[PDB]
Design a protein around this ligand. Sequence first.
Ligand code: RUV
Length: 119
Amino acid sequence: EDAMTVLTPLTEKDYEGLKRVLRSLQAHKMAWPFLEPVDPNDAPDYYGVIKEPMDLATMEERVQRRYYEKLTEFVADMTKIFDNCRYYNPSDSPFYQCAEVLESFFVQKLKGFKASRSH
Ligand SMILES: CC(=O)Nc1ccc(C(=O)Nn2cnnc2)cc1
């Protein structure tokens, strides 16, 4: 990550861009497993093996409350969603596949956001 991503405070204009990035991910066809916290009835052992869970609704709450001070902090929460998924689930599961697709999409949108900040 470059110096702007790590050290430049998030402005109100930056926050309008983060809201747009988040809504794009929430609208994606393969986002369904990540929209809300993992249901422990669907995965009884999940909260014993994943110590820092994360999901898109928790991120939306944090964006609305202006939790994030730097872009790096927002990227870290998003990356946690995909890393948790690839660690918990086997490489041939549909959950793992959704993580691969949605992370590629996040990177495309994130590059777009970074470009709009600087120029
Ligand atoms: C985002 C995420 O990781 N969610 C998630 C992953 C795996 C299951 C799961 O194990 N479902 N299941 C029940 N019986 N066989 C398979 C449920 C939810």
